[PDB]
Design a protein around this nucleic acid. Structure first.
Length: 105
DNA sequence: TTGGTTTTTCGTGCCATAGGTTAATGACTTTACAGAGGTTACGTTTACATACATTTGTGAATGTATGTACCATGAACGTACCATAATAGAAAGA
């Protein structure tokens, strides 16, 4: 029990939520835990900054949609959180693996 | 000419120096419970005078008690309506 069961709710919010980005103000509210209700968790349970963990989660989620043989490549990053194609093109810094070649795999 | 690795800023995240509301046991203090002490107005126990009753003798009410000496010689002394048929009894002729 950390901050009255915030771990059991963060995962549910990440699962249920739409492609809306996750920031301090966005998740600070209906979360039931403010900035410090999340800082301790991100420091202890995860040990990684939000901008990298969210990007990794989006990449792991899109790894299946890229294999689902979808022709609308521009909408793949949009349906998962990346509001722009250039920002998602994160993939170069993470995998150094072609968008298209991976999409071909 | 186009995709992707490399690099630098920059707002954002993590760490550290400051300074204030407010949990701690307490010390409170206030209310409640526990201690004896003088006073009140009864409740039980006791003696004493007078009263209804109940216990005695005495004057009247009834009640059996034995008899009355001219002559009195049998009757119901006034009852009563008379229905109808099963079962025996004492005799009489069969």
């Amino acid at each position: 029990t950390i901050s009255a069961q915030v771990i059991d709710t963060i995962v549910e919010w990440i699962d249920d939520n739409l492609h809306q980005p996750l920031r301090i103000d966005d998740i600070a509210r209906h979360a039931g835990y403010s900035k410090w209700h999340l800082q301790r968790l991100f420091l202890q349970y995860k040990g990684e900054s939000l901008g990298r963990y969210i990007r990794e989660r989006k990449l792991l989620l899109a790894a299946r949609d890229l294999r689902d043989t979808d022709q609308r490549v521009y909408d793949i990053c949009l349906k998962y959180g990346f509001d722009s194609q250039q920002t998602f093109t994160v993939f170069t810094r993470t995998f150094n693996q072609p968008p298209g070649a991976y999409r071909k795999e």
